[PDB]
């Protein structure tokens, strides 16, 4: 297999760990783990190519003992995530994650990923955002942000329902394979 390294970044609680675990293990987790610490290397075939994809989960600022800069060397593709239930997590894409990723991983392809797509039509989510004069992120807003940051693509998924999960990793693998 062709070997590639994937790093996932984005705001705390936007669904990074659950996305990796659903992709890797095909089951939504029952216990809470801030960052996947088991070594996961996933086998995936795309366009008739066998690829081994190392999945590197990342910690928040508060985890000073496991700092994120150590994750960036030799990265082949980035998943840069926000949550569709959190317009705040989208605004951090240009203001925090893109400056960080492009600093440490110049010229590495980025897939922008909108997580928790199942919450777009969730009424608890709608009600809570409405009290803040907010609403769920629209797909067009994600695509616009993908243009702004020079992402290779924009994808939406739900780790909870599995919708779009495989496709995220397939797109990321295709990006990582580009010469
Ligand atoms: N509704 C919904 N909740 C999700 C989804 N993915 C994760 N969550 C929840 O969001 C919270 C944060 O998820 P986690 O993967 O730990 O986020 P991380 O901090 O980015 O690693 C947890 O309560 C998860 O159960 C999803 O696709 N849909
Ligand atoms: Mg996590």
Q: How far, in Å, is the centroid of ligand 2 from the Cα of 48?
A: 31
Give 102's Cβ-side CA count (13 Å radius): 10
Structure determined by: X-ray
Phi, psi of 133 (to 5 degrees): 55, 40
- Is residue 16 within 6 Å of ligand 1 at its C-beta? yes
Resolution for the entry shown, Å:
1.5
Ligand closest in space to the Cα of 113: 1
Please name the residue that has the structure tokens 């295709």.
Answer: 174
Q: Say if CB 168 and CB 46 are below 8 A apart.
A: no
Structural domains of the chain sorted by starting position, each given as residue range(s) with its CATH number in brackets: 2-177 (3.40.50.300)
Query: Whose CA is closest to 112, among 135, 134, 94?
Result: 94
- Is residue 129 within 6 Å of ligand 1 at its C-beta? no
DSSP type of residue 70: G
Residues 6+ positions from 25 with CB-CB distance below 8 Å: none
* Coil vs helix vs strand at 155: strand
> What are all long-range contacts of 150-155, with beta carbons under 8 Å and residues at least 24 apart?
150/110, 151/80, 151/110, 151/111, 151/112, 152/109, 152/110, 152/111, 153/111, 153/112, 154/111, 154/112, 154/113, 154/114, 155/111, 155/112, 155/113, 155/114
């Amino acid at each position: 297999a062709i070997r590639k390294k994937l790093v996932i970044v984005g705001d705390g609680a936007c669904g990074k760990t659950c996305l990796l675990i659903v992709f890797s293990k095909d089951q939504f987790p029952e216990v809470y783990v801030p960052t996947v610490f088991e070594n996961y290397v996933a086998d995936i075939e795309v366009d008739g190519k066998q690829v081994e994809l190392a999945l590197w989960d990342t910690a928040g600022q508060e985890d000073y003992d496991r700092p994120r800069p150590l994750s960036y060397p030799d990265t082949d593709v980035i998943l840069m995530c926000f949550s569709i239930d959190s317009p705040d997590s989208l605004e951090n894409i240009p203001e925090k994650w893109t400056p960080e990723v492009k600093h440490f991983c110049p010229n590495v392809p980025i897939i922008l990923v909108g997580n928790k797509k199942d919450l777009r039509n969730d009424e608890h989510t709608r009600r809570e955002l409405a009290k803040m004069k907010q609403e769920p992120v629209k797909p067009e807003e994600g695509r616009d942000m993908a243009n702004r940051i020079g992402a290779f693509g924009y994808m939406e998924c739900s780790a909870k329902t599995k919708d779009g999960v495989r496709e995220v990793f397939e797109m990321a693998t295709r990006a990582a394979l580009q010469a």
